[PDB]
Amino acid sequence: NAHHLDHKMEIKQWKKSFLCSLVFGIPVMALMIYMLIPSNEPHQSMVLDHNIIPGLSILNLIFFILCTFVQLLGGWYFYVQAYKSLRHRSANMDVLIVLATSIAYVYSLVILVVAVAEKAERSPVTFFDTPPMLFVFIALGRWLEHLAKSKTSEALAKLMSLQATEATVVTLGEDNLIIREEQVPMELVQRGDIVKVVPGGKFPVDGKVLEGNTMADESLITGEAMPVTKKPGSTVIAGSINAHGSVLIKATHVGNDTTLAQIVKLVEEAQMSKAPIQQLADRFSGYFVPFIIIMSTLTLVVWIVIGFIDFGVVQRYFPNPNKHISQTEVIIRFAFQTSITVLCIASPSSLGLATPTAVMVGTGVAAQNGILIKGGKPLEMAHKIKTVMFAKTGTITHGVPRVMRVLLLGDVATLPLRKVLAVVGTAEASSEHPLGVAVTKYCKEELGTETLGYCTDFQAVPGCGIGCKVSNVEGILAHFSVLIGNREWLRRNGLTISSDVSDAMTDHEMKGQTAILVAIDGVLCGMIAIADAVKQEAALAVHTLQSMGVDVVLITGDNRKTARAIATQVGINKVFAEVLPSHKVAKVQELQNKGKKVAMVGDGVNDSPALAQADMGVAIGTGTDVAIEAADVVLIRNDLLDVVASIHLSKRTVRRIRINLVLALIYNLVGIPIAAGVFMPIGIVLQPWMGSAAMAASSVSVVLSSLQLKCYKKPDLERYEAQAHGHMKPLTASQVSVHIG
To answer: Under a CB-based contact definition with an 8 Å cutoff, are residues 132 and 28 in contact?
Structure first.
């Protein structure tokens, strides 16, 4: 487990290989620098290059000895990978390395065999010091870029290796009295067991608190910086840290069913859906290396043909025609040096891993603050979103309503205040709507009676209203056809509604207090007020998106007047009201009909068809419920500011996508003419050993450009109302547009 993300074996192997290459690279460095820097009073004027036999200088013998070893002791790895790639129908960078070393060991050996055969008094300059300098600067570069590839998977490494493996289960007799205790392994612990915890221990299972009061912190899991207080009957998370003594819990989710496993599963899969930009960078990177061979070997022919056709062109560029070197023996060597440098300076890895490292670092940084962007396609999608769509219930409001004002409009004598709420409560209890549970709990806490009536013929039409009959209500009396719905609910059954009550119910409707209609047995019993408080983060979340340049729009199933009432409370322009949850897609299909990219800020299971139809889905508030298929962006914390911080961070990751792909093209397209030998007129050309040190400092530089994303402080509140200070205006409902048709 986590060995794929560890990179430990590659680090060990490349460090060992680099240390193995160092012991042979240091002597070549020492000899080259000793020959390079002259002394003021040399002992014998560099005696170390005294020829022993005509053709083979004593320095070239040492270089040959030191290079043959490295050719077959430190270079068989690249030979093996090149052979295994030639077994395939494609190539690799190891093909380039094998070519660059084979040429430098074949031509530089033929040029010395020729000098030995002709018994020349001077041993020519040979390409025998570059293979000892190629591998050190390649092994070091690979070791450093693998080390920098780590610390990109730091989030995944700290998340996967976060859950515990031993849990202290306990058996309770009747009143949590201890029967025995064991430490069951995680591989076989089952749901329903009772697990204790030690002071300072972990909460390894998602479950419910049995008894005892204790606060725990799970900052490394979700991201909050405060220890949440837990009471008997609350929910614990798998991975937290116990603080106060021992608590007893009942297991609910064990194994892959826990949230942390779901988070890891989602993050890992996020880097699988490659964006079309990555697909294009893959299609043009398959035909990249053969382009390098074809274009490099063209230079080798070019220099030779220009030398044999017009040697006088380069004659002025070659300073010293000596007796030991002919006009041809100098053009050939330069042609081969340039040819080797061209295909030894290209860095395909800087173009291959340009995007994936940036995507991985961005996703990992996001996952540390609750933001849980999935897929590579939504990453670049957030760059080109013009319009964002918001939901009302569960996204901008808290989600927990209550009852504020209750009035009676019928007759007090036959419909007293004691049973009018009881009948509607026992009617709505059969409904699962949050309105029903809110009114039922309000009635229970107000009347104080644990009992209720009985409801029959419970007809429930979603989005419009309900109708039923209630009886057996005499239980609370010791201390009836019912139709509940909206304004149009009581029209199609032919029952009138007065105008004053319509004015009365609109009085609280303007204030964001949605008011439900009560009518039992054809009598206008009274009017009921319900509302949900908008989160305090709604004012600034929209204000930034409009400031950033992304259009906003609200969709909601309630009536039109509440839509404008709730729009001004947050500051939206266009709103979609009077929509039943049947379609949810006709609205997206007409925002997207213009050709724009649309993204809905949903709430979870209730908006699955709309989020899937939309290009980007924001599932906010889905605490401990990460498993969502329709949405492509999931937010663990119910924090509306994170919507800003998701697109804000997504563009930054996409910003580094191009930067990495530009440094991978600048380096290649600038590294060719310098290596191609076009800079003889200026007078700067590269020895091949300098063509690999530039490659090592390229792959690391690409990765080090990605690790700069990790130093991303999460913008807290005080930063947000800093750039949003002084320019923000709440628009009235007069400048508000609504749906058409």
So the answer is: yes
* Among 348, 353, 350, 347, residue whose Cα is nearest residue 287: 348
Reported as type and span, the H/E element at residue 482 is: strand 481-485
Q: Measuring CA to CA, which residue among 201, 268, 202, 189 is closest to residue 239? A: 202
User: For residues 422 and 520, what is the distance between their CA atoms, to the nearest angstrom?
Assistant: 12
- Of the candidates 95, 128, 147, which has an alpha carbon nearest to the alpha carbon of residue 346? 95
The residue type of 300 is L
Domain 371-397+534-642 classification at class level: alpha beta
Cα-Cα-Cα-Cα torsion 160, 166, 170, 171, nearest 10 degrees, comes to: 90
- The structure's method of determination equals cryo-EM
How far is the C-alpha of 205 from the C-alpha of 201, rounded, in Å? Answer: 12
For residue 679, give the 3-state DSSP assignment.
coil
733 and 554 in contact (C-beta within 8 Å)?
Answer: no
- Contacts for 712 with CB less than 8 Å, ≥ 6 apart: 365, 649, 652
Domain ranges within the chain, ordered by starting residue: 1-161, 164-257, 371-397+534-642, 402-531
Q: Which amino acid is at 455?
A: C
Q: CATH assignment of 164-257?
A: 2.70.150.10
The distance of Cα 219 from the centroid of its chain, to the nearest Å, equals 18
Cβ neighbours of residue 532 closer than 8 Å, sequence gap 6 or more:
393, 397, 398, 399, 400, 401
Distance in angstroms (rounded) separating the CA atoms of residues 607 and 390:
11
Could you tell me the two tokens for 103? Answer: 């040429």
Alpha helices by DSSP H, listed for 150-190, are 154-160
Q: Which two three-digit tokens encode residue 168?
A: 């202290």
Instruction: Compute, in degrees rounded to 10, the torsion defined by CA atoms 478, 483, 487, 488.
Output: 180
Residues 6+ apart with CB under 8 A from 279: none
CATH number at 402-531: 3.40.1110.10
The b/e string for 349-367 (b: 16+ C-beta within 10 A; e otherwise) is bbbbbbbbbbbbbbbbbbb
Whole-angstrom Cα distance, residue 693 to residue 728? Answer: 53
Q: What is the largest CA-CA distance in the chain?
A: 130
